[PDB]
Amino acid sequence: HMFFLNLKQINDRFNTEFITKFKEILESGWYILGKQCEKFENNFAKYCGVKHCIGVANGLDALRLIIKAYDFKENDEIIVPANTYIASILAITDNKCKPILIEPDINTYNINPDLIEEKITKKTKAIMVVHLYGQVCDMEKIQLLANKYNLKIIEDCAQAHGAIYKDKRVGNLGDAAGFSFYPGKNLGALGDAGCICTNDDNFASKIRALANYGSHKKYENLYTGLNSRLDEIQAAFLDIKLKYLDEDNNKRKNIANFYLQNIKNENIILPSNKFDHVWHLFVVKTKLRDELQHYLNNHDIQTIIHYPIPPHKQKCYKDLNHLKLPITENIHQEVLSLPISPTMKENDFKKVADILNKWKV
Amino acid sequence: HMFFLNLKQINDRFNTEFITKFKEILESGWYILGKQCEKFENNFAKYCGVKHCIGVANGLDALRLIIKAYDFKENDEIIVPANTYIASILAITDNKCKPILIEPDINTYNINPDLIEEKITKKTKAIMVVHLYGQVCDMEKIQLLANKYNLKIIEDCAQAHGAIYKDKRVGNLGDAAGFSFYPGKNLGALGDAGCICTNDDNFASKIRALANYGSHKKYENLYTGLNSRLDEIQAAFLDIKLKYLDEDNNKRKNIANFYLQNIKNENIILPSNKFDHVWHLFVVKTKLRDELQHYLNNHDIQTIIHYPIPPHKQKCYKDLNHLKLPITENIHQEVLSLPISPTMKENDFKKVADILNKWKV
Numbered sequence: 202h203m204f205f206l207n208l209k210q211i212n213d214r215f216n217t218e219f220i221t222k223f224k225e226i227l228e229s230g231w232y233i234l235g236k237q238c239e240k241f242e243n244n245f246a247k248y249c250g251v252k253h254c255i256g257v258a259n260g261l262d263a264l265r266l267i268i269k270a271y272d273f274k275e276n277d278e279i280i281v282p283a284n285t286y287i288a289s290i291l292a293i294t295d296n297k298c299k300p301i302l303i304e305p306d307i308n309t310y311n312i313n314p315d316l317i318e319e320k321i322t323k324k325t326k327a328i329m330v331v332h333l334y335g336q337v338c339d340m341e342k343i344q345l346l347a348n349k350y351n352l353k354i355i356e357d358c359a360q361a362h363g364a365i366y367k368d369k370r371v372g373n374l375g376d377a378a379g380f381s382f383y384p385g386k387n388l389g390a391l392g393d394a395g396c397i398c399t400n401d402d403n404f405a406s407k408i409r410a411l412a413n414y415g416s417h418k419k420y421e422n423l424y425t426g427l428n429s430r431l432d433e434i435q436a437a438f439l440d441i442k443l444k445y446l447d448e449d450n451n452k453r454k455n456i457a458n459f460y461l462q463n464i465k466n467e468n469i470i471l472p473s474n475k476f477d478h479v480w481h482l483f484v485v486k487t488k489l490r491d492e493l494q495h496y497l498n499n500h501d502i503q504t505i506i507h508y509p510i511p512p513h514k515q516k517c518y519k520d521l522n523h524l525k526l527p528i529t530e531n532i533h534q535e536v537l538s539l540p541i542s543p544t545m546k547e548n549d550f551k552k553v554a555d556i557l558n559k560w561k562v
Numbered sequence: 563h564m565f566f567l568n569l570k571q572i573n574d575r576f577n578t579e580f581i582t583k584f585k586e587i588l589e590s591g592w593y594i595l596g597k598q599c600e601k602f603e604n605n606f607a608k609y610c611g612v613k614h615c616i617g618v619a620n621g622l623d624a625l626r627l628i629i630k631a632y633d634f635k636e637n638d639e640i641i642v643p644a645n646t647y648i649a650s651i652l653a654i655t656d657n658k659c660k661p662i663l664i665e666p667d668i669n670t671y672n673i674n675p676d677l678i679e680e681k682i683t684k685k686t687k688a689i690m691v692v693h694l695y696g697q698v699c700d701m702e703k704i705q706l707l708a709n710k711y712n713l714k715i716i717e718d719c720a721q722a723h724g725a726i727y728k729d730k731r732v733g734n735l736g737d738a739a740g741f742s743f744y745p746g747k748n749l750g751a752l753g754d755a756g757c758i759c760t761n762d763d764n765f766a767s768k769i770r771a772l773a774n775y776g777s778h779k780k781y782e783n784l785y786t787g788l789n790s791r792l793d794e795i796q797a798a799f800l801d802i803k804l805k806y807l808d809e810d811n812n813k814r815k816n817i818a819n820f821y822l823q824n825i826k827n828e829n830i831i832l833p834s835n836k837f838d839h840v841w842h843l844f845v846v847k848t849k850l851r852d853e854l855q856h857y858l859n860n861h862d863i864q865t866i867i868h869y870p871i872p873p874h875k876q877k878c879y880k881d882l883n884h885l886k887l888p889i890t891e892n893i894h895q896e897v898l899s900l901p902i903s904p905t906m907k908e909n910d911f912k913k914v915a916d917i918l919n920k921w922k923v
């Protein structure tokens with residue numbers, strides 16, 4: 202059984218260091234908001250080329266906190282792609298803002314920047330850009346729109362750790378960015394984890410407070426805060442793995458290129474990489490998706506759909522069910538993710554391509 | 563220096579077992595919502611005598627989830643002691659409910675049951691009892707009241723793991739209970755951690771979904787949920803320690819009773835318990851609190867204040883600052899916590915008593 206994402210394979214490279222750092226943190230007696238958090242933050246900040254990195258409990262928290270720290274009014278509007286993972290939207294509604302859902306470009310799977318301005322209203326306060334599947338969004342126009350209409354840009358970076366746009370990294374393309382380090386992400390923890398990145402000193406300091414109960418100083422609560430912190434253990438594990446993140450992303454680039462160069466099947470539309478793509482998810486598109494998934498499973502290849510029901514169609518968002526978003530809806534009916542990881546064996550990726558080429562419907 | 567809480571001493575007993583479990587989880591390649599969580603949950607349910615335990619990310623999330631799951635209307639009222647830790651109140655306001663702050667009994671530091679009924683209104687939906695410092699609340703009148711008015715009882719168990727009221731454990735004394743396993747809790751993780759306990763099947767399934775993005779089935783989101791999970795690793799650490807929790811609590815009793823029997827100083831009011839007490843914190847009370855804390859530090863003994871500013875006085879709740887709660891305010895001006903731990907050295911507790919006896923002020 203070739204697994205969709207073999208984490209033990211990804212992480213076995215680091216066991217001996219992992220155990221070392223664990224023992225160290227044991228030796229320290231310090232498990233929360235300590236020197237491993239500081240060290241990881243400082244390194245990830247350098248990595249994204251930003252001034253400030255605040256470790257938090259997960260990527261949904263990271264998003265929810267950024268939105269919270271802006272103090273928007275109830276029903277203020279945040280423009281967001283309609284085809285993202287639900288978490289992006291959950292962060293908006295958690296904060297009693299209104300998500301304004303924009304169709305993607307079929308050629309990027311990212312928000313179509315040409316479709317945003319028409320949806321901008323007096324209630325709009327932000328654009329949440331999502332670098333979906335690993336590919337950075339085309340920022341040029343979004344940035345112009347944000348300057349023009351006095352909007353914040355919030356990056357959801359949970360799928361594109363390390364992707365580059367012009368001179369900058371994801372995380373440094375907007376006003377503030379949220380990252381997930383859930384274990385299957387291109388930089389994955391061994392438990393839940395997240396961070397926020399920004400260059401603004403005041404904003405960063407406010408975020409630190411809000412993620413630690415609303416307290417800047419012992420005994421005192423300046424804001425109504427959250428408990429959303431990155432555990433020492435998880436910061437340590439992340440820092441060890443961050444050293445090899447670009448390498449890992451490159452190993453993904455190699456497998457994706459192999460897929461792109463070798464899968465030749467009329468029933469399958471392959472993903473393109475118009476801008477930098479770190480290939481978190483290798484997403485193909487076919488009118489016979491569920492059939493493909495079954496076929497692959499029959500050949501001992503596990504595949505997972507990202508994603509089959511779009512946020513507007515979910516039961517939790519009944520009041521959005523009527524929205525007509527046919528590009529999003531078609532994608533959701535048609536996509537399927539092929540196994541990819543930095544450690545994935547040659548024999549395994551060759552088998553995926555060979556079996557796809559044999560699929561004859 | 564005698565530190566207020568030496569987690570290295572608490573935890574070093576278990577170091578070999580922690581390391582064993584960590585490797586086992588590395589072997590598993592399964593870090594979230596797995597077998598360690600299930601095992602721990604099962605054992606903590608047993609420990610509390612409840613049907614269901616849901617591990618979640620922290621004790622504040624645990625409370626916030628419980629209130630969320632009840633789906634109360636905006637400005638629905640929740641009665642709550644006025645002198646608890648701010649997390650108890652944060653859970654209420656986050657959910658857009660109005661906290662109705664009740665004075666404690668000066669002789670228990672828990673909510674005075676006799677002061678609740680007069681504050682009940684048509685908008686009241688719940689009573690959140692807090693077992694402060696480790697002492698269980700006198701539950702009988704509270705349970706009768708909730709039944710009389712069709713209110714939910716929410717237990718904030720963050721500080722009282724394993725305390726017993728008549729025939730039941732804290733966690734099994736209302737409709738649903740929230741627990742913190744913050745590292746310095748009587749049952750402390752190595753990272754942030756918490757849980758929710760309940761006997762109600764439907765509430766338990768709803769909470770599991772609300773803690774996992776609102777998802778009860780792969781690809782579907784029934785609710786607008788959040789991400790609040792207990793890492794496999796922390797579940798494993800908690801399960802190791804849980805087997806020693808009653809032993810450890812009784813060891814804390816022995817030390818507290820030593821303090822109670824041996825400290826005699828006209829300047830200090832001891833925390834004589836009226837109900838079972840697992841002594842998470844051992845809180846004394848003096849008119850010269852700031853002078854006391856300095857004196858102890860002069861004698862190389864670290865103390866902390868639980869707590870110096872009450873919620874209604876915090877800058878984050880300026881809409882509550884006007885409230886006249888003099889018992890609460892008095893407590894906050896006069897309390898200080900002394901070091902206690904089930905592994906605390908005899909010379910250390912003896913020192914603390916002797917040095918306090920010598921204090922002439």
Ligand SMILES: [Cl-]
Pocket residue numbers: 259260261381382383394395789
């Ligand atoms: Cl996440």
Ligand SMILES: [Cl-]
Pocket residue numbers: 499
């Ligand atoms: Cl076949």
Ligand code: NA
Pocket residue numbers: 258392393432619753754755791793
């Ligand atoms: Na966590």
